[PDB]
Homo-oligomer: A and B are copies of this chain.
Amino acid sequence: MNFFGLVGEKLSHSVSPQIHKRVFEILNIESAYKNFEISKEDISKLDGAIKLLGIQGVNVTVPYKERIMKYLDFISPEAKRIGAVNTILLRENMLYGYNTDYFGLDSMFKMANIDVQGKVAVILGTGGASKAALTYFIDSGIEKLYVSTRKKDDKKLLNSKAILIDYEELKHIKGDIILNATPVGMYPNVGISPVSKSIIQNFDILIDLIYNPGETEFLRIGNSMGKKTCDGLYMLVGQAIKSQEIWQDTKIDNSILDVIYNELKLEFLG
Any B CB within 8 A of the CB of A169: no
Any B CB within 8 A of the CB of A46: no
**Are A78 and B249 in contact, with the CB atoms below 8 A?**
yes
Kindly state the separation between the CA atoms of A96 and B75 in the bound complex, as whole angstroms: 10
Any B CB within 8 A of the CB of A150: no
**Of A4-12, A87-95, A214-222, the one with at least 4 CB within 8 A of chain B:** A87-95
**Are A94 and B77 in contact, with the CB atoms below 8 A?**
yes
Query: Closest residue to A135 on the B side, CB-wise?
Result: B92
Tell me the minimal C-beta distance from A89 to chain B in angstroms: 7
Interface of A is mostly: mixed
Which residues of chain B are within 8 angstroms of A249 by Cβ–Cβ distance? 76-78, 251
Kindly state the separation between the CA atoms of A75 and B77 in the bound complex, as whole angstroms: 10
Question: What are 24 A-B contacts with C-beta separation under 8 Å?
Answer: A74-B74, A74-B75, A74-B76, A74-B77, A76-B96, A77-B89, A77-B91, A77-B94, A77-B249, A78-B91, A78-B92, A78-B94, A78-B249, A80-B91, A80-B94, A81-B91, A81-B92, A245-B251, A249-B251, A250-B254, A251-B251, A251-B252, A251-B253, A251-B254
- 13 further A-B pairs in the complex, CB-CB below 8 A; given A73-B77, A77-B91, A251-B253: A74-B75, A74-B76, A74-B77, A76-B249, A77-B96, A77-B249, A78-B91, A78-B94, A81-B91, A250-B251, A251-B251, A251-B252, A251-B254
Q: Interface on A for B, CB 8 Å cutoff?
A: 73-78, 80-81, 89, 91-92, 94, 96, 245, 249-254
